[PDB]
Structure 1
Amino acid sequence: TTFLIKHKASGKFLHPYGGSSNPANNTKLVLHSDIHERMYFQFDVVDERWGYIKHVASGKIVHPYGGQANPPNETNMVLHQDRHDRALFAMDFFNDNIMHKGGKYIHPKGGSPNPPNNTETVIHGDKHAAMEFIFVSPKNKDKRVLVYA
């Protein structure tokens, strides 16, 4: 299932910085208000809840920068071609968050409920309203879709 990753508090979406159909390895993931095919994602299940968050246009997936199993707070989120267990996430559509295998979450850097366009996303352990995400239809940005199959 293809979906948009929507920051719940702001309504902005996860994008590769620059919006390329083929971002280079280690391109940062940011929040931005635009909708287009280069901010579409899919989720590839690896082990029950755990899987890869895949940028549809390029096939690269979401990583903590440097590929840590236990990335520290403020580690940047990036896209990278590699597939390994340090790029595993769970798409928690009940609590509305995205958790890395190490137990921390994807946040907007700085934790704003209304981050401006091109705000970087990072790992952080905190849980609060400004780190919530919902997963929605590319044809209807208010319609939640099931990302697991």
Structure 2
Amino acid sequence: MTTFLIKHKASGKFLHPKGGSSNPANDTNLVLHSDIHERMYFQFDVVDERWGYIKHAASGKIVHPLGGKADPPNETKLVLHQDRHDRALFAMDFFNDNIIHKAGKYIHPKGGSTNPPNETLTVMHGDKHKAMEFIFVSPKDKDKRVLVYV
């Protein structure tokens, strides 16, 4: 209904909390993995027009740049954390197919590969290219895009 999968467009892998738990601890890395299950479902909670929080559905933790700085440098790891604040604001660009942080960098697989192996970490990086594209799909139809602004 409000849940979606975050699919890495080039590989078909998905974003997961590292370890696949329903209850990841604060500062758990966000990784890529091929598996599908309810513990990799996400929601998006709108805060201000396009900006909002990317939320792990099972735990309520949201996506942060590790350390929570307003303008994180390239290669800053993405983690899950319960805190809510303006440095965890992202927009879900379903027209250009990417996820952009409030300060202008994007979510990437670490290393920028179109075919990242399972457990690859995700990081912030300012470049735009095929390997940083993501689409947002229905849990019950992994090829059907869904509106995350809901």
Same structural fold, with TM-score higher than 0.5 when normalized by the shorter chain: yes
- Determine the structure 2 residue equivalent to 1:54: 55
Matched residue SS, 1:122: strand
- Unaligned segments of structure 2, at least 5 residues: none
**Structure 1 stretches of 4+ moved >4 Å:** none
- Determine the structure 2 residue equivalent to 1:23: 24
- Determine the structure 2 residue equivalent to 1:70: 71
- Unaligned segments of structure 1, at least 5 residues: none
CA distance in 1, matches of 2:102, 2:37: 28
Number of aligned residues: 149
- Determine the structure 2 residue equivalent to 1:105: 106
Compute the RMSD of aligned alpha carbons: 0.4
- Determine the structure 1 residue equivalent to 2:3: 2
Give deviations 1:43-66, integer Å, cap 9, x for gaps: 000000000000000000000000
Give deviations 1:96-122, integer Å, cap 9, x for gaps: 000001100000000000000000000
Letter in 2 for 1:113: T
What is the percent sequence identity of the aligned residues? 88
Letter in 2 for 1:80: H
Matched residue SS, 2:45: strand
- Determine the structure 2 residue equivalent to 1:95: 96
CA distance in 2, matches of 1:92, 1:79: 20
Cα offset for 1:68?
1.0
Matched residue SS, 1:94: coil
Letter in 2 for 1:102: A
